[PDB]
Amino acid sequence: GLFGAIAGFIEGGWQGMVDGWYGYHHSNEQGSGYAADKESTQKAIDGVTNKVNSIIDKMNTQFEAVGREFNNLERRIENLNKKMEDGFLDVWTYNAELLVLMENERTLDFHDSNVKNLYDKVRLQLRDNAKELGNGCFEFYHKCDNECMESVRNGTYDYPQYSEEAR
Amino acid sequence: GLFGAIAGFIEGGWQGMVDGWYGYHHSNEQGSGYAADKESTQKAIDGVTNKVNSIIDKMNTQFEAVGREFNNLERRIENLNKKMEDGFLDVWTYNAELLVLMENERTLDFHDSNVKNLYDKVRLQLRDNAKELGNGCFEFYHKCDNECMESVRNGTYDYPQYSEEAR
Amino acid sequence: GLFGAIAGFIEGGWQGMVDGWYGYHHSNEQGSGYAADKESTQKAIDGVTNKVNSIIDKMNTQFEAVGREFNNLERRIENLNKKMEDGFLDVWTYNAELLVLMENERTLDFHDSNVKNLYDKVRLQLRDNAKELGNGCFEFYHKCDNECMESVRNGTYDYPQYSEEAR
Amino acid sequence: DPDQICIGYHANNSTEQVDTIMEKNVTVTHAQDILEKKHNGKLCDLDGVKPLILRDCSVAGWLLGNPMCDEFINVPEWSYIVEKANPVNDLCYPGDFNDYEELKHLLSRINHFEKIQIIPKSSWSSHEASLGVSSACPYQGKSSFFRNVVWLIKKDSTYPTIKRSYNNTNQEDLLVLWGIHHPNDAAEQTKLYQNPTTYISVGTSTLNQRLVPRIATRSKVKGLSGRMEFFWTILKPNDAINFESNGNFIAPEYAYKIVKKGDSTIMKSELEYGNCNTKCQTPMGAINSSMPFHNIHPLTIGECPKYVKSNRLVLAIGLRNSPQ
Amino acid sequence: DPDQICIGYHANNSTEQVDTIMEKNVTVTHAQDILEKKHNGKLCDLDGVKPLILRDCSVAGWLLGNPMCDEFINVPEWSYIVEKANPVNDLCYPGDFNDYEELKHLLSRINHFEKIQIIPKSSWSSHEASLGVSSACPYQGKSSFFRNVVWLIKKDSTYPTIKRSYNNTNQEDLLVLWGIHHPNDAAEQTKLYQNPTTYISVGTSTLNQRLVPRIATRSKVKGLSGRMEFFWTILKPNDAINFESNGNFIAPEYAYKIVKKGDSTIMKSELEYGNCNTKCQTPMGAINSSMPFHNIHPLTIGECPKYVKSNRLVLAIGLRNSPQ
Amino acid sequence: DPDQICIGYHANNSTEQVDTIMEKNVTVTHAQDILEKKHNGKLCDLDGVKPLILRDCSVAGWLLGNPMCDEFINVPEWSYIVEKANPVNDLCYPGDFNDYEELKHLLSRINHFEKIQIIPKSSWSSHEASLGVSSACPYQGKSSFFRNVVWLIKKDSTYPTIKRSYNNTNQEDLLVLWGIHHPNDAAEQTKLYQNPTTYISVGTSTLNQRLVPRIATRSKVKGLSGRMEFFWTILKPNDAINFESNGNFIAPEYAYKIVKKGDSTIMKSELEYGNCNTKCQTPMGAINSSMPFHNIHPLTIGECPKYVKSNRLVLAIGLRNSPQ
Numbered sequence A, B, C: 001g002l003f004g005a006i007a008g009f010i011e012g013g014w015q016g017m018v019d020g021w022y023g024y025h026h027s028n029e030q031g032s033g034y035a036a037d038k039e040s041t042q043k044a045i046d047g048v049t050n051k052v053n054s055i056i057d058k059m060n061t062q063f064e065a066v067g068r069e070f071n072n073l074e075r076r077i078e079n080l081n082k083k084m085e086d087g088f089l090d091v092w093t094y095n096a097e098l099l100v101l102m103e104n105e106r107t108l109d110f111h112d113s114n115v116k117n118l119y120d121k122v123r124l125q126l127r128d129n130a131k132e133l134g135n136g137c138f139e140f141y142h143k144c145d146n147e148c149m150e151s152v153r154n155g156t157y158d159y160p161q162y163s164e165e166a167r
Numbered sequence D, E, F: 001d002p003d004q005i006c007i008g009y010h011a012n013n014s015t016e017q018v019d020t021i022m023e024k025n026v027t028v029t030h031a032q033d034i035l036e037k038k039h040n041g042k043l044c045d046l047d048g049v050k051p052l053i054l055r056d057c058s059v060a061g062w063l064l065g066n067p068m069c070d071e072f073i074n075v076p077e078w079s080y081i082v083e084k085a086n087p088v089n090d091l092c093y094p095g096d097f098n099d100y101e102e103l104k105h106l107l108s109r110i111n112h113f114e115k116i117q118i119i120p121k122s123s124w125s126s127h128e129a130s131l132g133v134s135s136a137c138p139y140q141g142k143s144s145f146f147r148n149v150v151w152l153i154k155k156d157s158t159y160p161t162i163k164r165s166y167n168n169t170n171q172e173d174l175l176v177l178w179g180i181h182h183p184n185d186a187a188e189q190t191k192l193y194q195n196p197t198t199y200i201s202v203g204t205s206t207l208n209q210r211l212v213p214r215i216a217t218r219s220k221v222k223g224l225s226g227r228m229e230f231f232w233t234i235l236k237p238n239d240a241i242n243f244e245s246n247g248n249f250i251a252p253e254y255a256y257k258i259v260k261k262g263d264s265t266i267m268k269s270e271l272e273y274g275n276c277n278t279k280c281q282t283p284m285g286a287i288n289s290s291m292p293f294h295n296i297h298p299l300t301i302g303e304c305p306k307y308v309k310s311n312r313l314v315l316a317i318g319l320r321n322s323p324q
């Protein structure tokens, strides 16, 4: 996909992360587990929900009464109605089908962007204190216990505290 | 946003940069200030202007005369006109509203891309001679006077000249 | 463009790479040449082909018979048909013209993404064993013969094998 | 073993697929269809005024009081009219209804409707008013006629020239119906009406009509080569309708007070009333939906989604999910 | 302190907001509305030919010369016609205008228009031509009539059969108007025209018409139970119109040379002329705009933006800008 | 010199350009136009039933058998009708065709069509059937008439009242045509038909018609001030048409069995048949295309792309390519 993360350098999704769309998996001497990124997940939910609601709510609906009220010597007028009806059907059918195709592409690429952006936020905190493995994971050059792991997830990782043990 | 820079790792915009859309802020022993990137700004202006003009200019406009010329025993034909008029109103209303929503998303993401691309151009020139702080800024490991700063902005930064003082 | 690679940090295309859309150029003591990335090229071909076919195949086409069957004392009805015909012409003309403009932007940005993603795949394999020049090229700190070059292209580059000679 | 932190995304057991512009059949974690495909299979009120459901009668048979129709039950307002595709009981006595389609359109949606007697059947002192019957219009095994109009014939070999007026003293428009009989030949003409050369003149403040019977050798329809031709007008408050005739006159007895606000149309459907309410009615059932599109039926009445030729419009909500 | 260089973007004092597909109310540095919402409040020329503005007359009253209308001022061309919603002066003598809506459509846009005398009022030697007046059509406190046609009556208890022709020797189509009077009864019929059974035959190379007066007891309208019914045709160059009648004939005196290029329609508006020019006219004012959409009024004449139900269509130009 | 590996993309010698929303005239490596601009310049079969091509005759001249038309060749089915813009041979004897446009629409697409004799020309024993000719309808330098109907006149200074029936014993609907002659004056009336006051009554199970000749002083058209006016009906299987007349009757000899499935329309074109097949026909040629849009002509018959006002719709396929 467009941003290279989902089904890209991050090769697959996690069945084990049940409480959010995007997040983290850690492994250290104390254990391992998944933690959702609450903020990015909620923003994404709001974003996609807004898109769907706009597609729905921007439609202007008005009362119409559609019947067949012309007689056997009014076939030319009845044909005028046919062309109009068929014309609007063709317009709405094409526009609805393409809208769905195009917006589905946008939605999937939006998730991909969201994951890439989360990845990069971590990358720039860790910098030289961890190895970038190329698969979505970072391998620490120092011990990173649970409190350390949480500091990375909450964006307060203290690089100067660990640089010595990393080198 | 999609590219992660605007209101992302670059957390806010600069009131102080008045003469362009994207650019640089420097701080050294000689002082500080803002400089617009002329090239990226102009290309972006041309790009957005073209989009707006296309939305405007691609509309086919033709002469029509819209009145109500059917009588009290021509109500079925008058209803045919109603359905047509209302039908085109619904089509143009939906298409115009969604067009605006969708193109506004594109425009904001385009600016974000433009900023990310400018950032990356600098990043790759500086490489190992500066620290990437994660907030849009680079912290030099050497003195970078005004001429040095201009070399970065004009894309002619000489890495080999400073590598020794940086290490 | 949006992803910064095509006509960006990779300044121009290669006439010399005839057998694919995206790929690699290598230079070593044994010689030089171009190799297409088969996988990314094929996926891109499938992707663009699908888009074109969707634009074509999602159109609903039905039989209609368009003539001028109203007489000299049926001009008000004939005008109703005019407004309808002209109305559908304006709708299809606008939607077709913008569709082409918008999808062309998507297509060009898709190619750009595909190139950026290929670049990044290489970048993350090589890491510290090569210099990132900023122009799409990597300059090895070790000798990389033809077998080594192929390992990079097929995504099996062995970093630990060369790290010592690189340092 | 060194410690690791990884970035990743949600997967689940969903097999739901969507299509994108570049790729078909992409499995995702969650999706949402925006095409309405369901209806309740019933004919309902519309906002929420009941329709007029004519069962096996046409609008004309209902208005004129075709005796083969069900007895007239007062429905003082309705939102749309439902007829069967081919109502069995239309014009029992063969013939025609002038400007019939415009009348049906006018009656499609009505805010007030009330049948009133305007010319008592008993008031025809100089003509025979109880012999205007036909085997074509039976009621209970006996020849009868449209119940709301009167087929007058001669009395004592005399048909005096009729001069009758009705003044609309009501505060509402009045729908008035009358007819002319077209006999088979001159011998029949004089048998029924005495006078060989006849007319029906009808005048209001806007109407200026003079009908004359056309003789033609016509095909027997239900045993009859004769024809009835019906006409109508809207008599405004304080206006008067004036009839004059020396034969062939099918006179009004009852007319209808009407109040007209909006219009709708005539729905063709074989369904019966379903004691429900809706914003959007189709001939095979009502739609209750805020979705933008539907694929049920084109002949809708109400505020409906946009009709499309599609089996599904499925939006991705969640993320790319490995398929099964 | 180490030296720094930073990448960033423009912000300003803008509080302008836009909506995007994923987020509402995004504040940006610059935006542009593409919906036209303004008009000049005036009725203008169209490209730039003046409209025909009928003030308080209908097209029929204007054509026939209803005396209650303003005196005929020659306007030799126009782009569209403006009537008030309910023109007070239409048919002063009650009645009807045949194929009136088609005639109005034909006259909506005209390239040349010129009233000419085709049958002098003074040429009726065998009939009375100066008594065809009515209290329903006053001019200056005295009974009069439509000024462009002549209500002929008997002279010396005689109405000789009229045989009159006009040949279109002009190089332009000619709009010709005539009428028939429908009296109240036979006593009135013979009082005005002597002859009890009358006709009006009208023939051209295409027209083959025979009118007969219909008697009906009609409601008094402006004190009158009589009716006038008007007819028209387009007489081609070198064709002749031939009238024949022995009563009830409302004869032409004046007709109109016309040159027809395009069509437009009849605009209903209460506004007066505003000495302006425009490409797009609405009934509440003209639009001067290159914008793709507008929300002013659906009943437009000209080359207009697309009409939508929207209060704003605002495009982002600049960047996300911190709100206030 | 150190070893290098580089990432890059394809370029070629293409000068093809496209436009994008943000940038015009972008040169790319490969592109594809989705606008159909080509046609074959021929009139073709449609799916694949041949059209009825009338050469220099109108539908009316063809149906009635205008002798100036080409002799009737049986075409038992067709998909659409082609007329020239202005067919030279229409009604040889001047006049009119009632409900002509509806009839043309009905005949636009026909599944079965077969001319049959319904009333032999030889069966008119009491009237003259071989003198109904005119210089306006020549065949081979001699006065003639529409070949499918018969202009009856008096015989031995007598025109007995006609009473004729035809019963549709066929299994298909029957299109029946007749006419009335409108003479110039009473002297001509009695010269042709003896009787001064005449009628034509026509009845079926649905039709109830009575025509009377209108006298008018009309302009000579092709030397003639007389007029023929034609009428038609669809006679259902097992129904009978009954004619009665004492003058002015233009009788049927031939009628047409028809089977009606779909409809199409009348195409106006100056092209001839091209021995081809197509799904989409235009008046200047047929389209064979699966493209979504075309710009050839709006007056198409068939399953066509969407008509647009555009010179090109070019999609990028390949990549940005340096221009020349």
Ligand SMILES: *[C@@H]1O[C@H](COC2O[C@@H](C)[C@@H](O)[C@@H](O)[C@@H]2O)[C@@H](O[C@@H]2O[C@H](CO)[C@@H](O[C@@H]3O[C@H](CO[C@H]4O[C@H](CO)[C@@H](O)[C@H](O)[C@@H]4O)[C@@H](O)[C@H](O[C@@H]4O[C@H](CO)[C@@H](O)[C@H](O)[C@@H]4O)[C@@H]3O)[C@H](O)[C@H]2NC(C)=O)[C@H](O)[C@H]1NC(C)=O
Pocket (backbone or CB within 6 Å): D167, D168, D169, D238, D239, D240, E219, E220
């Ligand atoms: C349909 O019906 C409308 C109402 O009809 C009715 O009023 C009277 C006539 C009764 O029949 C009653 O039963 C019924 O409800 C009708 O209207 C009436 O039209 C009449 C036409 O002439 C008119 O009659 C005249 O009334 C004059 C008095 O008018 C004043 O007083 C009225 C009562 O208060 C008031 O409504 C008026 O506004 C006004 O102030 C009389 O002086 C007239 O004189 C007589 O004229 C007769 C012949 O016309 C002669 O016989 C007499 O010698 C004398 O000369 C006359 O009676 C009545 O006023 C109208 N009423 C209203 C409310 O308008 C309407 O015309 C009918 N519609 C038709 C036919 O199309």
Ligand SMILES: *[C@@H]1O[C@H](COC2O[C@@H](C)[C@@H](O)[C@@H](O)[C@@H]2O)[C@@H](O[C@@H]2O[C@H](CO)[C@@H](O[C@@H]3O[C@H](CO[C@H]4O[C@H](CO)[C@@H](O)[C@H](O)[C@@H]4O)[C@@H](O)[C@H](O[C@@H]4O[C@H](CO)[C@@H](O)[C@H](O)[C@@H]4O)[C@@H]3O)[C@H](O)[C@H]2NC(C)=O)[C@H](O)[C@H]1NC(C)=O
Pocket (backbone or CB within 6 Å): E167, E168, E169, E238, E239, E240, F219, F220
């Ligand atoms: C409407 O008007 C058209 C023009 O009318 C006029 O021409 C004449 C008749 C005058 O009335 C004049 O004031 C007016 O402008 C009209 O047309 C004319 O139709 C006439 C019908 O017969 C026709 O008259 C005939 O003309 C013959 C000569 O024709 C030659 O010369 C003409 C003058 O140069 C020329 O225009 C012609 O092209 C041609 O070269 C005569 O020889 C005819 O003979 C006479 O016929 C009379 C009865 O018909 C008898 O009384 C005589 O004994 C003799 O036999 C005859 O006069 C005239 O030529 C037509 N002119 C044109 C330009 O076409 C048109 O018919 C009118 N439209 C209607 C009625 O629908």
Ligand SMILES: *[C@@H]1O[C@H](COC2O[C@@H](C)[C@@H](O)[C@@H](O)[C@@H]2O)[C@@H](O[C@@H]2O[C@H](CO)[C@@H](O[C@@H]3O[C@H](CO[C@H]4O[C@H](CO)[C@@H](O)[C@H](O)[C@@H]4O)[C@@H](O)[C@H](O[C@@H]4O[C@H](CO)[C@@H](O)[C@H](O)[C@@H]4O)[C@@H]3O)[C@H](O)[C@H]2NC(C)=O)[C@H](O)[C@H]1NC(C)=O
Pocket (backbone or CB within 6 Å): D219, D220, F167, F168, F169, F238, F239, F240
């Ligand atoms: C158009 O044509 C339809 C078919 O016409 C034909 O049938 C007969 C009449 C011949 O003319 C034949 O050449 C032609 O194909 C027509 O229909 C017929 O309408 C007739 C109207 O009366 C009707 O005739 C009656 O038939 C009775 C017998 O009916 C039984 O037998 C028939 C033959 O097997 C069968 O089709 C019927 O279903 C039924 O079982 C007779 O007993 C009737 O009695 C006579 O009535 C006469 C006057 O009406 C008197 O002269 C006699 O004294 C006696 O009283 C009578 O003959 C015939 O049955 C109908 N046939 C069908 C198939 O329906 C149709 O009416 C025509 N359409 C019109 C006019 O609009």
Ligand SMILES: CC(=O)N[C@@H]1[C@@H](O)[C@H](O[C@@H]2O[C@H](CO[C@]3(C(=O)O)C[C@H](O)[C@@H](NC(C)=O)[C@H]([C@H](O)[C@H](O)CO)O3)[C@H](O)[C@H](O)[C@H]2O)[C@@H](CO)O[C@H]1O
Pocket (backbone or CB within 6 Å): D131, D132, D133, D134, D135, D136, D143, D151, D153, D182, D183, D184, D188, D192, D223, D224, D225, D226, D227
């Ligand atoms: C009153 C009566 O019975 N008169 C006899 C005629 O009916 C009969 O002619 C036959 O008429 C048949 C149809 O009969 C009715 C009907 O429609 O039912 C009988 C009705 O009473 C009569 N109604 C009135 C108001 O007159 C009605 C009416 O006359 C016609 O419909 C008018 O068009 O006719 C059927 O048409 C038969 O074809 C026909 O023979 C004759 C028998 O010769 O005698 C009459 O006394």
Ligand SMILES: CC(=O)N[C@@H]1[C@@H](O)[C@H](O[C@@H]2O[C@H](CO[C@]3(C(=O)O)C[C@H](O)[C@@H](NC(C)=O)[C@H]([C@H](O)[C@H](O)CO)O3)[C@H](O)[C@H](O)[C@H]2O)[C@@H](CO)O[C@H]1O
Pocket (backbone or CB within 6 Å): E131, E132, E133, E134, E135, E136, E143, E151, E153, E182, E183, E184, E188, E192, E223, E224, E225, E226, E227
């Ligand atoms: C000439 C005259 O005054 N004749 C007397 C009749 O007018 C009068 O009948 C009354 O007529 C009233 C309307 O009067 C006019 C009119 O419309 O103004 C008077 C016009 O002069 C007359 N015009 C012509 C050309 O004849 C006109 C015309 O006859 C009718 O409109 C034709 O339908 O009538 C009004 O209708 C009254 O209701 C009516 O009583 C009678 C009185 O008995 O005497 C006539 O001599």
Ligand SMILES: CC(=O)N[C@@H]1[C@@H](O)[C@H](O[C@@H]2O[C@H](CO[C@]3(C(=O)O)C[C@H](O)[C@@H](NC(C)=O)[C@H]([C@H](O)[C@H](O)CO)O3)[C@H](O)[C@H](O)[C@H]2O)[C@@H](CO)O[C@H]1O
Pocket (backbone or CB within 6 Å): F131, F132, F133, F134, F135, F136, F143, F151, F153, F182, F183, F184, F188, F192, F223, F224, F225, F226, F227
């Ligand atoms: C039979 C014949 O020749 N009768 C003489 C009239 O024709 C002639 O009047 C002239 O008629 C001219 C047109 O002649 C035809 C025609 O249309 O060709 C001749 C046809 O034979 C005749 N057909 C029939 C069935 O009667 C036809 C028909 O009467 C009319 O079209 C009916 O409207 O007329 C042309 O109109 C001339 O203007 C006219 O003088 C007169 C001469 O006075 O003598 C007749 O004996």
Ligand SMILES: *[C@@H]1O[C@H](CO)[C@@H](O)[C@H](O)[C@H]1NC(C)=O
Pocket (backbone or CB within 6 Å): D013
């Ligand atoms: C899929 O997962 C959901 C959430 O745990 C569960 O409710 C549902 O039953 C699962 N589907 C299966 C087991 O087929």
Ligand SMILES: *[C@@H]1O[C@H](CO)[C@@H](O)[C@H](O)[C@H]1NC(C)=O
Pocket (backbone or CB within 6 Å): D024, D025
């Ligand atoms: C997508 O799915 C449908 C079955 O639901 C199948 O018929 C179609 O061929 C599939 N298309 C592709 C490209 O796999």
Ligand SMILES: *[C@@H]1O[C@H](CO)[C@@H](O)[C@H](O)[C@H]1NC(C)=O
Pocket (backbone or CB within 6 Å): E013
């Ligand atoms: C916002 O900034 C512009 C540009 O300096 C200025 O012209 C405008 O007045 C400012 N708005 C204020 C002060 O409200």
Ligand SMILES: *[C@@H]1O[C@H](CO)[C@@H](O)[C@H](O)[C@H]1NC(C)=O
Pocket (backbone or CB within 6 Å): E024, E025
């Ligand atoms: C956006 O702005 C309008 C006021 O201009 C407000 O009514 C609406 O609720 C806002 N929506 C959101 C989601 O803030």
Ligand SMILES: *[C@@H]1O[C@H](CO)[C@@H](O)[C@H](O)[C@H]1NC(C)=O
Pocket (backbone or CB within 6 Å): F013
């Ligand atoms: C462009 O390149 C193609 C592929 O080699 C070649 O077939 C074509 O002739 C070239 N165009 C020229 C030489 O103008």
Ligand SMILES: *[C@@H]1O[C@H](CO)[C@@H](O)[C@H](O)[C@H]1NC(C)=O
Pocket (backbone or CB within 6 Å): F024, F025
């Ligand atoms: C794009 O190309 C056309 C010629 O094909 C030219 O007329 C037009 O001006 C060009 N536009 C730009 C912006 O270069």
